[PDB]
Design a protein around this ligand. Structure first.
Ligand SMILES: [Mg+2]
Ligand SMILES: [Mg+2]
Ligand SMILES: [Mg+2]
Ligand SMILES: [Mg+2]
Ligand SMILES: [Mg+2]
Ligand SMILES: [Mg+2]
Ligand SMILES: [Mg+2]
Ligand SMILES: [Mg+2]
Ligand SMILES: [Mg+2]
Ligand SMILES: [Mg+2]
Ligand SMILES: [Mg+2]
Ligand SMILES: [Mg+2]
Ligand SMILES: [Mg+2]
Ligand SMILES: [Mg+2]
Ligand SMILES: [Mg+2]
Ligand SMILES: [Mg+2]
Ligand SMILES: [Zn+2]
Lengths: 60, 116, 83, 127, 99, 155, 207
RNA sequence: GGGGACUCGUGAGAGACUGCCGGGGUCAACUCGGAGGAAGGUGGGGAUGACGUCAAGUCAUCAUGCCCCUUAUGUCCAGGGCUUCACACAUGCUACAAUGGCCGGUACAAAGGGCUGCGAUGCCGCGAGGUUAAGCGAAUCCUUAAAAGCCGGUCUCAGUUCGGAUCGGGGUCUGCAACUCGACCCCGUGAAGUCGGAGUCGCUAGUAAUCGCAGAUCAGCAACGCUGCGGUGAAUACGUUCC
């Protein structure tokens, strides 16, 4: 998103309820996971690149 | 058979027949019939006068009835109107007071459709 | 905080602006921005100034509204009608 | 070496333990009538047996687990269908014509994205 | 007896088997005893991501995680093989616990 | 569809009654997946019936179904500037299913308390020839007979 | 587009994950610095022509494998730049690092390098209609290439309207799972914007 | 304790390939029917989106050619707003009941989640919940009792023993904080709604339908939304005249 906002998210805000998570790679504020710390698009392309382990597609 | 002024219709069973009273529900009837000993399965046309005495005091001494709930509810909504609160203003203007959505809804607090 | 084990919630930035005035018995208004503090029976007859979002509205806690919250008496959105 | 047969319909597992006897069907240590109240289930509980006309003997025993009522019924029917042929090498064509030894593969297919269920689709609303 | 228990864990096949069957085997040559490899049911973690950066709900992608579990449970305890167990070149994606 | 007819589904013999029409009528009655409920309803209808019939209940239900079986329906078609109907013969497997579907539909709106004895008196009055589906039989029949003039468009 | 990643497909079928480790609780903060190290090694080092980057991490000892076109620049005067990127990696990860810049055994059949070569030449502003052809000729001189498809999209020479054209030869079965197809995509930088260069290279069914 | 019988777990595999027989067809492609077979002609489902089209969407994931601000479009913070409301459209959940309402007893799952945690038992409270605390980074323990289902009893066609919006009062939990604007619980109150016009939607089998369960995001949550799991479980398709 904005650099001031990614800095704010990386910092330690007061009133810990205020703390949230952004993308680890682009700073997207939405659709970000916790086990991945990584948003949906920047998880999709990373996993397609196979640069994060244990991930593939599925079919059941 | 007027119990307290609600005039229970005949051919009815106690546990729901008492529920017509303004202020006494089914869970309440489970105790009005428990502390008086009156069984759940009965016909109100077979109600004994002595039994109606047994519940003509328990209700008035341990519950609260028609009139002295309606007066209280109008009294406190009137208090919200008079104190100039958000809820009171909302109640005057007739749209939902508990923060319900007022864009494609609020039909219950408003009336039928208008179609301006 | 709405739980009857942790007491009410009243801002400490307000408690010691109201108690120091209650002790010397004055009716000066405290210009505050706290929609969240629960009014307790210690501001009876007292006048606050509440920030609804654009300006301040005075509120006179007379005898009975004390059982509500300060932010409830602050209209914020401005609507009159479509016509 | 006593026999051990396994039967399944869609998830239910039954383990049939055929024994020659007088007729006593205690599935999972429990009676047929009180376990399955559905006459629909206890026709097919003995349908493979009445197919070969050996009802009055060879009491069975099975451990029930998984699925639902019809699942367990189908599992037990498959179990008996594959149970009789181990003690009798002559009823195989009869049971095959009856078509009871078939596994009956019918699984609930998955929900697919973009839809309200597996195939049930959201309302179109052309405009 | 049940003094040593390992929980070799990884992400995929043909790694856990190689790390167990041929690298815990290095202890049985010393007169030890193992009960063979024990397979454990594999979990399946599932996600669902919107393909497009904007405006398209009805197109998604599925990404999953398999973590495969195995146990061995070597039994016979010998003092001279504790160091042998400690000095094992485990493969990169396999993790080992001692119980 | 396009590639010929689709295979039908077999229905096994009923345990109570060595007959298939019971097994198929109960499935017609079936709604939302209560096979158990619909089955006890059908069985209760027949077992309530035998007292007022004396005849075997499936025999009575066959007598009813022979009454309410259609023969010739009124299937629609549009040719030029005005649509109309075509009298077409109904094959028996369609006819019985349509008849007992009418039975279920008009037993869902008949005037008693509940559907067990609703269907029960439906079965007996259809075996006696007086019912609502019974009168539908000879009104659909006469509607189709009044359009026999268009039977020469048989697709 | 409408083409999925062949790497995403054949990940676990034909090709392998770039990073192999195990974690349950500290995977998130491994990924956090993995993205950082890829930024670091992709920033300021474009001259070496990175091909791919492997990461291994096992109980507080990490190994960063790097395959590039030229191992010459990164090593420098016998370790003047390799140790420099090692130090700027140490101050980043707080962890002793076995960095291993190996090689790409041939930097002309390996996609993710064909794309960068074409892109750098586009930045040099010579004809992409010679670039793609010479990529074809350079990619058909190896013993193992049964097909290559090159696709470039963008303004492509100062055109006001973009355009995306591709050349190909041999067979490149992107719908075949048993097909070893290696994919590369690089963003050529030029005076009028950015040009997408994507290359698929098919190296047989499987070995 | 014990045993490799079975299940199950999960590794390697085998099997389905018109493979064999009967008929038709230039002896072809193939086609109808059979034997064996768990599965028969692609066994079912999914992943898979050719060249391109829409100057389709995204300059707000990211990157970016040009244009634009620098005591302001930068930037921090408290509040309020993105949740408003005579209307209109769109997608859904609950209903308008007896194939049901309620009381009681009683069975049968699958898939997932758990250390910033799962909270077994015991006790208190009608309940949300509260406390002590065992065990569990989990095929171990928790989640967990799945719900629809079966048995018996009551209710008896009523705006009801339907519906649960609505309101007052009282609360729990999270969160510094619950009014704008969170969720859950108890009592009383008990609206519209009695099957919905023109018109219109989905669905061919373990499908529609119906019933719960789980997850991501998430301190909490407007979770009826989205993605998944399983219980019960259908009726029809003569056929291509028409759309
Ligand atoms: Mg749409
Ligand atoms: Mg294909
Ligand atoms: Mg456009
Ligand atoms: Mg636009
Ligand atoms: Mg810009
Ligand atoms: Mg602000
Ligand atoms: Mg909005
Ligand atoms: Mg019960
Ligand atoms: Mg208790
Ligand atoms: Mg009942
Ligand atoms: Mg109700
Ligand atoms: Mg009404
Ligand atoms: Mg009605
Ligand atoms: Mg949540
Ligand atoms: Mg949050
Ligand atoms: Mg389902
Ligand atoms: Zn991102």
């Amino acid at each position: 998103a904005k650099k001031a906002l990614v800095n704010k998210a990386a910092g330690k805000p007061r009133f810990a309820v205020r703390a949230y998570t952004r993308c680890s790679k682009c700073g997207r504020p939405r659709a970000v996971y916790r086990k991945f710390g990584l948003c949906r698009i920047c998880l999709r392309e990373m996993a397609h690149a196979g640069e994060l382990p244990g991930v593939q597609k599925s079919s059941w | 058979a007027r119990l307290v002024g609600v005039d229970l219709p005949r051919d009815k069973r106690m546990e729901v027949a008492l529920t017509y009273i303004f202020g006494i529900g089914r869970t309440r009837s489970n105790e009005i019939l428990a502390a008086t000993g009156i069984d759940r399965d009965l016909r109100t046309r077979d109600l004994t006068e002595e039994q109606l005495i047994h519940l003509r005091d328990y209700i008035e001494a341990n519950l609260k009835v028609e009139g002295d709930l309606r007066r209280e509810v109008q009294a406190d909504i009137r208090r919200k109107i008079e104190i100039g609160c958000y809820q009171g203003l909302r109640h005057r203007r007739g749209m939902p007071v508990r923060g319900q959505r007022t864009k494609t809804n609020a039909r219950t607090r408003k009336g039928p459709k208008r179609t301006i | 905080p709405r739980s009857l084990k942790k007491g009410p919630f009243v801002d400490e930035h307000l408690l010691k602006k109201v108690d120091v005035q209650n002790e010397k018995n004055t009716k000066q208004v405290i210009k505050t921005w706290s929609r969240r503090s629960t009014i307790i029976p210690d501001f009876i007859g007292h006048t606050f100034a509440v920030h609804d979002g654009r300006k301040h509205v005075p509120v006179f806690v007379t005898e009975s509204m004390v059982g509500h919250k300060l932010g409830e008496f602050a209209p914020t959105r401005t609507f009159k009608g479509h016509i | 070496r006593p026999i051990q047969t396994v039967g399944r319909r869609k998830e239910a597992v039954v383990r049939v333990r055929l024994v020659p006897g007088t007729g006593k069907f205690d599935l999972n240590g429990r009676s047929l009538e009180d376990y399955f109240p559905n006459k629909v289930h206890q026709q097919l509980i003995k349908a493979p047996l009445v197919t070969v006309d050996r009802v009055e003997s060879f009491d069975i025993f099975a451990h029930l687990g998984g699925g639902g009522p019809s699942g367990q019924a189908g599992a037990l029917r498959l179990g008996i269908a594959r149970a009789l042929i181990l003690v009798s090498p002559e009823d195989r064509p009869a049971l095959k014509k009856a078509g009871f030894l078939t596994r009956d593969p019918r699984a609930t297919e998955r929900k697919k994205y973009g839809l309200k269920k597996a195939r049930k689709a959201p309302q179109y609303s052309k405009r | 007896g049940q003094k040593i228990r390992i929980r070799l864990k990884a992400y995929d096949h043909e790694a856990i088997d190689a790390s167990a069957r041929k690298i815990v085997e290095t202890v049985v040559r010393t007169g030890a005893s193992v009960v063979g490899p024990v397979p454990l049911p594999t979990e399946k973690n599932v996600y669902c991501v919107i393909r497009s950066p904007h405006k398209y709900k009805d197109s998604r992608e599925h990404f999953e995680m398999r973590t495969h579990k195995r146990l061995i449970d070597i039994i016979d305890p010998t003092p001279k093989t504790v160091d042998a167990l400690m000095r094992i070149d485990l493969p990169a994606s396999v993790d080992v616990n001692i119980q | 569809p396009r590639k010929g007819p689709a295979p039908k589904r077999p229905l096994v013999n009923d345990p109570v009654y060595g007959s298939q029409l019971v097994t198929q009528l109960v499935n017609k009655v079936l709604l939302k997946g209560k096979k158990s409920l619909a089955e006890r309803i059908v069985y209760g209808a027949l077992e309530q019936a035998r007292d007022k019939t004396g005849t075997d209940p499936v025999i009575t239900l066959k007598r009813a179904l022979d009454n309410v079986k259609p023969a010739l329906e009124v299937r629609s078609r549009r040719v030029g500037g005005a649509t109309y109907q075509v009298p077409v013969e109904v094959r028996p497997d369609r006819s019985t299913t349509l008849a007992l579907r009418w039975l279920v539909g008009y037993s869902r709106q008949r005037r008693e308390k509940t559907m067990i004895e609703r269907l029960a008196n439906e079965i007996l009055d259809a075996s006696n020839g007086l019912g609502a589906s019974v009168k539908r039989r000879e009104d659909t029949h006469k509607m189709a007979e009044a359009n026999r003039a268009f039977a020469h468009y048989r697709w | 587009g409408q083409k999925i990643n062949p790497h995403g497909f054949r990940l676990g079928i034909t090709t392998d994950w770039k990073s192999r480790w195990y974690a349950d609780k500290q995977y998130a903060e491994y990924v956090k610095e993995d993205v950082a190290i890829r930024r670091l090694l992709s920033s300021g080092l474009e001259r070496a022509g990175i091909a791919d980057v492997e990461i291994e991490r096992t109980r507080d000892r990490v190994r960063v494998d790097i395959h590039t076109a030229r191992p010459g620049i990164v090593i420098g005067r016998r370790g003047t730049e390799a140790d420099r990127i090692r130090a700027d990696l140490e101050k980043l990860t707080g962890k002793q690092v076995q960095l291993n810049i190996l090689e790409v055994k041939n930097p002309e059949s390996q996609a993710q390098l064909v794309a960068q070569g074409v892109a750098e030449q586009l930045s040099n502003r010579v004809a992409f209609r010679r670039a793609m052809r010479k990529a074809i000729q350079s990619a058909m001189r190896q013993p193992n290439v049964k097909g290559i498809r090159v696709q470039c999209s963008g303004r492509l020479g100062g055109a006001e309207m973009s355009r995306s054209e591709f050349y190909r030869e041999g067979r490149v079965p992107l719908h075949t799972l048993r097909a070893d197809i290696d994919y590369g995509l690089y963003e050529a930088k030029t005076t009028f914007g950015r040009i997408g260069v994507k290359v698929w290279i098919y190296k047989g069914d499987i070995v």
